[PDB]
RNA sequence: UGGAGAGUUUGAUCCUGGCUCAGGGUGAACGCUGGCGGCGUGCCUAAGACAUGCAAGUCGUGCGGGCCGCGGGAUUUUACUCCGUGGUCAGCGGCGGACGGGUGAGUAACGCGUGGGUGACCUACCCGGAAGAGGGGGACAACCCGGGGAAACUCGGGCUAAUCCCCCAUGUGGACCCGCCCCUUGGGGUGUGUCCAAAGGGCUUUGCCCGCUUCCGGAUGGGCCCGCGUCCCAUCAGCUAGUUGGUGGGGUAAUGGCCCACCAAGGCGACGACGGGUAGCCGGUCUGAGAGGAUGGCCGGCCACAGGGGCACUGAGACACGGGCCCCACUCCUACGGGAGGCAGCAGUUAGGAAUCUUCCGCAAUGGGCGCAAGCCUGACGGAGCGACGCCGCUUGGAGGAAGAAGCCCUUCGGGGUGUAAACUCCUGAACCCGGGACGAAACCCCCGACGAGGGGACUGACGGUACCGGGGUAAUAGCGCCGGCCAACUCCGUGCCAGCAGCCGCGGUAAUACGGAGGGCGCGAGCGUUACCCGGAUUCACUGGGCGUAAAGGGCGUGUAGGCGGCCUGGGGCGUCCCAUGUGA
C-alpha cells in the first residue's frame, strides 16, 4: 500500500515545499516554513556536492512523492509514456494527472491527494454516473467526475465544495460547484502545470 | 564451506545447507553455510542484517 | 468429417468463442481451417455474434456438419434463411 | 515448379546415371560477402547420351534410385572439361591431407 | 481389469483367418496359371487365370485385398500369363485376354 | 524514437588488459516477513517404483438367446405348449477404441522449419452428382452336453439368427491385359476379351425415415520426394560392400537398394565425409540501440515414445499408452505345474532432491465417440482447492494537531534529532453482520408449417447463495535490505589484525562513517534480501565493431595446389544486384 507515514517531512528533505497535507502544508508551516532542511540528526550541516545520480534520484523522488504513488506503479507509467507518441516527459505528466485520485484533488473535492485517495476508495466518487473506487483509474477526456449523491451531506465534502466558492480550476478541467461535479476537458500540457520538477532529470534517471 | 556469523553450533555430523559464495581470504572455500536451516541454528543476539544469518524477529520493543 | 463448431477463447469466467471450421479429430482449441465468426454468449457488447455467411454457406456446400449450437448461431445470422 | 538446376557432368562411370556438380552462390548471412558452394546430383540418363564435360540442366524428379531424384533435362553446351579439371584436382588434393 | 472390447481381439482373429485363406487361394491359383502357361496351355491356362482374376476382384470387395493391390495382382498375373504363352503357340480358348 | 558507465596494476601518468559492480529476466529455491482479491502459474531431480478409485465406449431402429418376474391363450386336467410384457446378463454384429489426454527418453534425421513436387499415391465418417439392390446357400458364439487346470483360463461334442460369411444374376459404372487416339513419367478417352456390386431395419405403413452397393466429383486428413536452412570437437581424416548404379522380380496405396536374384564398379569427403559429444525441432521467449547473444518452460504446430528389445494381426487409418505375440528386467499370486501386472491419463503414495498442488465439484457450457431419437460414455473440458511462485489491483486510514510531551540518541552543555510524528479533536468506514441476487442457456426435444425456411413451446447451472446491487458498520498489519568508494543514506557507544565483514577495491593492530549494537538516515514495500542461471555492460571473438615494432599476436624463408581477389574499351546473356505485381509467411 501507498506510503503511510510522516509527510510534511519530505515537504523537507526534497528541498522544495510539496503539498501532501493541503490545508496546513499551505500556512505558517509545510513544517517547511519553520525548518527548511533535511530530517534527521545531520539535517543542518554543510550539504555535500550531490552526485549526478543523487540529483536525478531526488528529482524523481520529488515527482513521485507529490502524486503519492508507489515506485512500481510510477515506473510502469513512465514506461507507458515512453512507448507512446510525443514528448515523453509531458506525456508521463499527462498520465500522472489523469489518475482519478488526482483529478478529484485537482477538482477541489478533496484538499489533499492523500485525502482524495480515501474519497475515491470509499465510494464517494463517480465517473460518468457509474461509481468507481480505483485511485489509479485513468480519467480520459470527456469524463464527468461527480461526487456521490449519497455522500454529499458529509461535512468534509461540504466544506471543500464551499471553499471552492471563489476558486479557479486548471485549464484542462471545469467545475459546476453546486452540482458538485467537474469535467476532464483534455489532458494537461507541461506548461499547464507548475510543478517544481524538471522531468528531463527524471527521464534521465530511468536511462541506466 | 564457511560458517558465517557471530558464533555457531556445528559439530561433527551436522547436516546443513550450502549456498555458494567464496570467502577469498580462505583458499578453497567457495561456499557459505546458510544459517537457520537444518542443524545450523541462526545467529542469536543479531539485531541488524538478520535474514542472512537467519534469525527471527525479536520481541521486546516489537 | 469437418465441422463448424466453437473454439474457446477469452478467459476464466469470460467465455468468448470462435465459430470455426476444423476437422472433428482436432483438439477443441487447436489448429483450425478458417474462422468464420465469433460469438460472445454474455452479450457484454452490442455486437455479440457475427458470421461470414457467404463462407458458412461455402462450408456447408462442401459437407461440414455443424455442432447443434454452432448451427443455432448460424441459423440466427440467417445462414439457412432463404427466399 | 519442379526445381531445375544446371551444372556440369563430372562422372559417367555408372550405367544410365550422370553425376552433376552444381554451383550455387549467395551472400553470407553475417559477413555479406558473396560465396560459392556446390553439390553433386546423381541424374538419370536412360540413354547414356550425356558425357564428361557437358553442361546440363537437371530437373526434380520422381525417384529412380536411392539418392537419384533428378533427370537430365537438356544439354546446355558441350565442352567444359576445364570445370571438370577443377573438380578432379580438388578431389586428388584430398590424399595430400591424411596421415 | 476386464476391458470388454478385447472383443475386438476375438473379431480380429476370425477376420484374419478369413483373409488369410482368401489370399492363399489367389496365390496357389495364380502360380497354377503361370505354371500352365509355361507349357503353352489352351483353355486351362486361361480358364484358371480367369478363375483367379475373379478371386482377386472378389477379395478386393472386402478388407482383404482392398483397392488396387487387386489391380496390381491382376496386372502382374495376366501379363506374365500372356508373355509365357507367346513363348510357344496361339492364345487358344480366348478366355480372359483382349484379342 | 534508439546507444550513460564506474572500481581495481603506479609514488604519480598515459596505454594495454583481465577481474568486479550498477540493468533486465525466472517453471525457481533459501532467509526474514506476510492482510485482501482477480488472472496466471506450480517435479527443473528418478523416461524411478507404484496401494486404492476413476480415466472409451456405445447401438434393442442389425441378430438370436439365457436368467428373474407379471399378464393373456391352446386346456378343463394340470403334462405339454402359443403370444404379449417388465427387469437384467452377456453373446453375435456394427461404428468408435489410430482421436482426445500424457511425456521428451531417444533422435544431429527430409526429425524439424520453410518453399516446392506427386504423370508415384491413399483417405472411414461428411457434401454433390449418375445408377442399382433379383435369385439361392453356408457357418460360428450365445444356449445345451461332456472333459482338463489350484487359479489365469482352456479342450471336445451338438443346435441357431442377422446389416456375419459365400455362390449365381443384373453391370449405371469400375478393374485388368492387348490395341488405337489425345496428353506427355503411371494424366484423359476408346474397342474386343475377361473380371467385380449390394442388407436390411423402423414406422403415426403404398411413402416416408435410418441404412446397403458401384462409380465420378468435392471437402478434410495423410504418405512419399525435392531446394534451402538447422549446435560443439579435426587432440575424429579418410568413410562405404545393399555399399553406388543397372536389368528383372518381390513388397506397398505409391516412388525408391524398401527387400531379393543377377550384372557393372561404383558412391561420399577439408564447401568437413567417417567418428565422438550434446540436444526433441518450430511458432516463440529473454536480452540487446541494433546487429547479435542466450533460450524452446506455459500456450499452439510437427516429430518421437508408452517398464527395456523385437514383431505382426485387425483395420480407411496402428505396427496400436489403458489390443495381441515372443524375449529381457523388476513387483505380486502360485496346490511349484503355471500364471498376473505396466499412472510419461486424473488424482494420490513413495524415493530422490534446494524444490513443485487436491486421492475436490460438475458434465451446466465447449468439444469428442456411438445412437433415428431419448440418451449413454467422456479425470477431454468447465470449475473449485492448495503454494505471495508471478503479474495487476487494493488495505493498514483522512484533515486538523507545539517553537515542539515523554522515552531513546546526539551535544560546543548554549542546543539539536526522531517530529505533525505521537497523545488528543473532528471525518471516512477494509474486516465483519443484514437483505436481494446473476450473466454464462438456447439448442437438442415437442407442436404449426413439410421432418426444409420461418414461427411457437418446454427442460437444463458444477462454479454459487459466488460475482454484482442495496442497508448497517469497527481506525483497523509492516516488513526487508542498505548507509567506506562504485552508491541514495553519519553519528555515539562496544570492540582492539580479536570477534568479525568482504561483489571488487579492501576494512579490523584503542577514537573504525567498512566489524557488533544503538540513535538517525536512504531505498523498496506484502514484500524485501540471498544463492543460482541467461543476455547486458563486454567495441572483452569486434558483420555493424578490435587488434599483431616494444603491451597477447607476422608463420624462419621460399615455391607453389585448391581457394579468395582482378587493369581499359565494345557487344551479347541477365546468375548475382535492383524494381513492379502476385502467392506464402496459421
Ligand atoms: N510423484 C512426484 C514425482 O512425479 C514425477 O513424475 C512426474 C512427471 O512424469 C509428470 O509431471 C508432469 C511433468 O512431466 C511435465 N513437466 C508437465 C507438468 N510439469 C507435470 O504435470 C504432472 O504433474 C502435475 C502436478 O505436479 C499434474 O498437474 C499434471 O497433470 C501431471 N501431468 O507426471 C509426474 C507427476 O505427474 C517423478 N516420477 C518423481 O519425481 C515423482 O513421481
Ligand atoms: N537437401 C538438403 C538437406 O540436407 C540436410 O542434410 C545435410 C545437412 O544435414 C548436412 O550438411 C550440413 C552442411 O550442408 C552445412 N554447410 C554444414 C553443417 N554443419 C552440415 O550439417 C551436418 O553436420 C552438422 C554438425 O555436425 C549436423 O547437424 C549433421 O550431422 C549434419 N547436418 O549433411 C547434409 C548435406 O550437407 C537435411 N537433413 C535434409 O533435411 C535435406 O536433405
Ligand atoms: N597491426 C599492424 C599490421 O596490420 C597490417 O594490416 C592492416 C593495416 O595495414 C591496415 O589497417 C589500418 C591501419 O594501418 C591504420 N592504423 C588505420 C586503420 N584504422 C586500419 O584499418 C583497419 O581497421 C579499421 C578499423 O579500425 C577498419 O575499418 C579497416 O577496414 C581496416 N583496414 O590494414 C590492415 C587491416 O588490418 C598487417 N596485418 C600486419 O602488418 C600487421 O598486423
Ligand atoms: Mg533536521
Ligand atoms: Mg463392441
Ligand atoms: Mg605493474
Ligand atoms: Mg597504489
Ligand atoms: Mg578496466
Ligand atoms: Mg490460483
Ligand atoms: Mg448387449
Ligand atoms: Mg497426443
Ligand atoms: Mg493438460
Ligand atoms: Mg552425432
Ligand atoms: Mg485430397
Ligand atoms: Mg441370404
Ligand atoms: Mg462346433
Ligand atoms: Mg455383408
Ligand atoms: Mg457401360
Ligand atoms: Mg457377379
Ligand atoms: Mg520396381
Ligand atoms: Mg534428450
Ligand atoms: Mg553489444
Ligand atoms: Mg535453437
Ligand atoms: Mg516398447
Ligand atoms: Mg489389412
Ligand atoms: Mg507407433
Ligand atoms: Mg495406463
Ligand atoms: Mg527427501
Ligand atoms: Mg458435456
Ligand atoms: Mg456434448
Ligand atoms: Mg495525520
Ligand atoms: Mg460513523
Ligand atoms: Mg553517498
Ligand atoms: Mg553487513
Ligand atoms: Mg572506537
Ligand atoms: Mg559496508
Ligand atoms: Mg554497523
Ligand atoms: Mg502489489
Ligand atoms: Mg559482444
Ligand atoms: Mg571488424
Ligand atoms: Mg584489443
Ligand atoms: Mg610481443
Ligand atoms: Mg618475418
Ligand atoms: Mg607465391
Ligand atoms: Mg590461383
Ligand atoms: Mg573486372
Ligand atoms: Mg537476374
DSSP output for B22-50:
--SSSTT---BBPTTSTT-PPPTT--SST
SS3 C15: strand
Known binding residues of A for Zn(2+) are 8, 11, 25, 30
Q: C-alpha distances in angstroms, A198 versus A16, D78, D83?
A: 12, 79, 72
Q: How far apart are CA C74 and CA C72, in angstroms?
A: 5
Q: How far apart are CA D23 and CA A126, in angstroms?
A: 74
Cell of B40: 545450523
- Of D61, D67, D82, D84, the residue nearest D14 (C-alpha): D67
Number of structural domains chain C divides into: 1
SS3 C26: coil
Cell of E82: 500372356
CA angle A128, A133, A135 (to 5 degrees): 100
Q: How far apart are CA A70 and CA B30, in angstroms?
A: 39
- For residue E23, the surrounding DSSP H or E stretch is helix E7-37
Q: How far apart are CA A169 and CA C33, in angstroms?
A: 58
Q: How far apart are CA A29 and CA A31, in angstroms?
A: 4
Q: Are A110 and A119 in contact (CB under 8 A)?
A: yes
For CA atoms C58, C60, C66, C72, the dihedral sign is positive
Å between D32 CA and F337 C1'? 79
Å between A2 CA and F395 C1'? 9
Q: Which domain holds residue C50?
A: 1-83
SS3 D88: helix
Q: How far apart are CA B59 and CA D32, in angstroms?
A: 69
DSSP character at residue A189: P
SS3 C11: strand
Does domain D1-99 match CATH 3.20.20.70?
A: no
Q: Closest nucleotide (CA of D2 to C1')?
A: F117
Residues 6+ apart with CB under 8 A from E63: E15, E19
Which CATH number goes with the domain that contains A46? 1.10.1050.10
Q: How far apart are CA C29 and CA C22, in angstroms?
A: 10
Q: How far apart are CA B47 and CA B40, in angstroms?
A: 18
Long-range contacts of D71-78 (CB under 8 A, 24+ apart): D71/D43, D71/D44, D71/D45, D72/D18, D72/D20, D72/D43, D72/D44, D72/D45, D73/D4, D75/D50, D76/D6, D78/D53, D78/D54
- For residue C50, the surrounding DSSP H or E stretch is strand C49-51
Q: How far apart are CA C55 and CA C44, in angstroms?
A: 26
Q: How far apart are CA D24 and CA D7, in angstroms?
A: 9
Beta pairing class for D34-44 and C64-66: unpaired
Q: How far apart are CA A145 and CA A109, in angstroms?
A: 10
DSSP character at residue B57: P
Q: Are A182 and A145 in contact (CB under 8 A)?
A: yes
Q: Report residue C76: phi and psi, to 5°.
A: -55, -40
> Which single residue is written with the C-alpha cell 537438356?
D74
Tell me whether residue E30 is exposed, middle or buried, using C-beta atoms within 10 angstroms of its C-beta: 0 to 12, 13 to 18, 19 or more.
Answer: buried
Q: Report residue A91: phi and psi, to 5°.
A: -50, -50
Q: C-alpha distances in angstroms, A126 versus A121, A199, D4, E62?
A: 11, 31, 72, 76
Cell of A72: 512500481
**Helix-helix angle E69-86:E43-61, to 10 degrees:** 170
Q: Report residue D42: phi and psi, to 5°.
A: -90, 120
Å between E5 CA and F87 C1'? 25
Tell me whether residue A64 is exposed, middle or buried, using C-beta atoms within 10 angstroms of its C-beta: 0 to 12, 13 to 18, 19 or more.
Answer: buried
SS3 E97: coil
Does domain E1-99 match CATH 1.20.58.110?
A: yes
Q: How far apart are CA A154 and CA A109, in angstroms?
A: 12
Q: Do residues A170 and A151 both lie within one domain?
A: yes
Q: Report residue A189: phi and psi, to 5°.
A: -75, 160
For CA atoms A77, A82, A88, A89, the dihedral sign is positive
Which CATH number goes with the domain that contains C33? 3.30.1320.10
DSSP character at residue A6: -
Q: Report residue A205: phi and psi, to 5°.
A: -50, -35
Q: How far apart are CA E1 and CA A198, in angstroms?
A: 77
DSSP E strand boundaries for A28-135: 125-127
Cell of A106: 485537482
Number of structural domains chain A divides into: 2
Q: Do residues A206 and A189 both lie within one domain?
A: no
SS3 D11: strand
Ligand 26 centroid to Cα of residue E3, in Å, is: 22
Å between B56 CA and F431 C1'? 28
Q: Are C16 and C38 in contact (CB under 8 A)?
A: yes
Q: Chain F positions under 7 Å from a protein CB? A: 1-4, 22-23, 30-35, 38-40, 56-58, 90-97, 99-101, 115-127, 153, 165-168, 174-179, 185, 191-198, 213-214, 218-221, 224-229, 237-238, 244-247, 249-258, 264-271, 291-292, 299-302, 313-318, 320, 322-324, 340-341, 354, 365-369, 380-384, 392-401, 403-404, 409-410, 416-421, 426-430, 439-444, 452-454, 471, 475, 477-482, 486-491, 499-506, 516-526, 528-532, 543, 561-565, 575-577, 586
CA atoms within 13 Å, Cβ hemisphere of A8: 19
Q: Which domain holds residue A26?
A: 1-96+194-208
Ligand 18 centroid to Cα of residue D34, in Å, is: 64
Beta pairing partners, C7: C18
Q: How far apart are CA A48 and CA A150, in angstroms?
A: 54
**Helix-helix angle E7-37:E43-61, to 10 degrees:** 160
- Of B62, B36, B39, the residue nearest B51 (C-alpha): B36
SS3 D74: strand
Q: What is the largest CA-CA distance in chain E?
A: 67
B42 alpha carbon, distance to own chain's centre: 6
Q: Do residues A14 and A90 both lie within one domain?
A: yes
Q: How far apart are CA D34 and CA D13, in angstroms?
A: 34
**Helix-helix angle E69-86:E7-37, to 10 degrees:** 20
Count of CB atoms situated within 10 Å of the CB of A112 = 20
Chain A residues 57-116 with Cβ under 7 Å of strand F are 57, 61, 70-73, 76, 82-83, 86, 88, 111-112, 114-115
A154 alpha carbon, distance to own chain's centre: 23
Rg of chain E over CA atoms, in angstroms? 18
Cell of D93: 588434393
For CA atoms A54, A56, A62, A65, the dihedral sign is negative
Return the domain boundaries, chain E.
Answer: 1-99
Å between E71 CA and F195 C1'? 11
Residues 6+ apart with CB under 8 A from C16: C8, C9, C10, C38, C39, C40
Following DSSP, what letter does each residue of A161-182 receive, concatenated?
Answer: HHTTTT----TTEEEETTTTEE
Amino acid at each position: 500500500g501507498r506510503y503511510i507515514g510522516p509527510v510534511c517531512r519530505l515537504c523537507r528533505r526534497e528541498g522544495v515545499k510539496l503539498y501532501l497535507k493541503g490545508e496546513r502544508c499551505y500556512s505558517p508551516k509545510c513544517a517547511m516554513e519553520r525548518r527548511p532542511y533535511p530530517p534527521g540528526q545531520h539535517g543542518q550541516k554543510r550539504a555535500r556536492r550531490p552526485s549526478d545520480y543523487a540529483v536525478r534520484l531526488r528529482e524523481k523522488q520529488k515527482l513521485r512523492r507529490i502524486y503519492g504513488i508507489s515506485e512500481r506503479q510510477f515506473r510502469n507509467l513512465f514506461e507507458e509514456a515512453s512507448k507512446k507518441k510525443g514528448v515523453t516527459g509531458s506525456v508521463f505528466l499527462g498520465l500522472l494527472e489523469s489518475r482519478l485520485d488526482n483529478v478529484v484533488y485537482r477538482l477541489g473535492f478533496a484538499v489533499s491527494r492523500r485525502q482524495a485517495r480515501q474519497l475515491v476508495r470509499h465510494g464517494h466518487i463517480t465517473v460518468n454516473g457509474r461509481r468507481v473506487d480505483l485511485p489509479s483509474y485513468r480519467v480520459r477526456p470527456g469524463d464527468e467526475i461527480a461526487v456521490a449523491e449519497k455522500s454529499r451531506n458529509l461535512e468534509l465534502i461540504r466544506q471543500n465544495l464551499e471553499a471552492m466558492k471563489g476558486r479557479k480550476v486548471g485549464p484542462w478541467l471545469s467545475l459546476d460547484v453546486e452540482g458538485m461535479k467537474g469535467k476532464f476537458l483534455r489532458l494537461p500540457d507541461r506548461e499547464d502545470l507548475a510543478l517544481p520538477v524538471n522531468e528531463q532529470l527524471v527521464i534521465e534517471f530511468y536511462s541506466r | 564451506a564457511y560458517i558465517p556469523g557471530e558464533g555457531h553450533n556445528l559439530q561433527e555430523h551436522s547436516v546443513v545447507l550450502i549456498r555458494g559464495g567464496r570467502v577469498k581470504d580462505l583458499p578453497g572455500v567457495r561456499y557459505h553455510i546458510v544459517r537457520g536451516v537444518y542443524d545450523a541454528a541462526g545467529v542469536k543476539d543479531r539485531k541488524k542484517s538478520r535474514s542472512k544469518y537467519g534469525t527471527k524477529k525479536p520481541k521486546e520493543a516489537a | 468429417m469437418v465441422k463448424i463448431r466453437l473454439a474457446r477463447f477469452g478467459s476464466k469466467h469470460n467465455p468468448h468463442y470462435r465459430i470455426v471450421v476444423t476437422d472433428a479429430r482436432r483438439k477443441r482449441d487447436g489448429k483450425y481451417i478458417e474462422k468464420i465468426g465469433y460469438y460472445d454468449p454474455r452479450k457484454t457488447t452490442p455486437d455479440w455474434l457475427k458470421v461470414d455467411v457467404e463462407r458458412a454457406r461455402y462450408w456447408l456446400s462442401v459437407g461440414a456438419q455443424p455442432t447443434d449450437t454452432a448451427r443455432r448461431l448460424l441459423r440466427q445470422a440467417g445462414v439457412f434463411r432463404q427466399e | 515448379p519442379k526445381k531445375v538446376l544446371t551444372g556440369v557432368v563430372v562422372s559417367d562411370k555408372m550405367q544410365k546415371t550422370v553425376t552433376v556438380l552444381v554451383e550455387r552462390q549467395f551472400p553470407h548471412p553475417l559477413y555479406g560477402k558473396v560465396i560459392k558452394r556446390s553439390k553433386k546430383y546423381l541424374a538419370h540418363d536412360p540413354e547414356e547420351k550425356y558425357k564428361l564435360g557437358d553442361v546440363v540442366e537437371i530437373i526434380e524428379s520422381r525417384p529412380i534410385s536411392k539418392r537419384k531424384r533428378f533427370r537430365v533435362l537438356r544439354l546446355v553446351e558441350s565442352g567444359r572439361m576445364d570445370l571438370v579439371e577443377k573438380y578432379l584436382i580438388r578431389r586428388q588434393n584430398y590424399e595430400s591431407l591424411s596421415k | 481389469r476386464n476391458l470388454s472390447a478385447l472383443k475386438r481381439h476375438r473379431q480380429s482373429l476370425k477376420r484374419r483367418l478369413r483373409n488369410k485363406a482368401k489370399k492363399s487361394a489367389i496365390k496357389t491359383l495364380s502360380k497354377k496359371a503361370i505354371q500352365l502357361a509355361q507349357e503353352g496351355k489352351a483353355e486351362e491356362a486361361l480358364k484358371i487365370m480367369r478363375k483367379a482374376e475373379s478371386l482377386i476382384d472378389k477379395a478386393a470387395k472386402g478388407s482383404t485385398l482392398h483397392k488396387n493391390a487387386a489391380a496390381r495382382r491382376k496386372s502382374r498375373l495376366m501379363r506374365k500369363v500372356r508373355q509365357l504363352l507367346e513363348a510357344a503357340g496361339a492364345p487358344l480358348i480366348g478366355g480372359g485376354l483382349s484379342a
